[PDB]
Amino acid sequence: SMSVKKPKRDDSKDLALCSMILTEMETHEDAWPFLLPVNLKLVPGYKKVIKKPMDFSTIREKLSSGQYPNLETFALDVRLVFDNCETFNEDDSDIGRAGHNMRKYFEKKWTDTFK
């Protein structure tokens, strides 16, 4: 509350560390469905159904330009990529499996770097 604060957690390395995670997600062999925005002219139903499209290149641009206020807003966009994937793709598809794999990969790196 006013003039009452928990001890200050060092957040000075968060930007660098989220960049490193994002690099590791970019270079994963199952990243290909997620590297670029889904083409809303060429994929029927995407535009109407997926209200907030997100992809790794869009996260990279937001990261590089100071549009994440804190590490939690960064994680929310990463998770959004996988939540969108599950909304649109059957579990038993190459893309559906890719999304589950990448979400696992992310959540481990997140826990190991920050928890």
Q: How many CB atoms lie within 10 A of CB 87?
A: 12
Give this entry's resolution in angstroms. 1.7
Those residues whose C-beta lies under 8 Å from the C-beta of residue 3, and which sit 6 or more positions away, are none
Experimental method: X-ray
The three-point CA angle 73-107-18 to 5° equals: 45
Q: Phi, psi at residue 38, to the nearest 5°?
A: -60, 135
DSSP SS3 for 108: helix
Ramachandran area for residue 66 (φ above 0: left; ψ -120 to 50: alpha; else beta): left
Domain positions in the chain are 1-115
Select from 1.10.260.40, 1.20.920.10, 1.20.1260.10, 3.40.640.10 the CATH code of 1-115.
1.20.920.10
| Cβ count within 10 A of residue 98 | 20
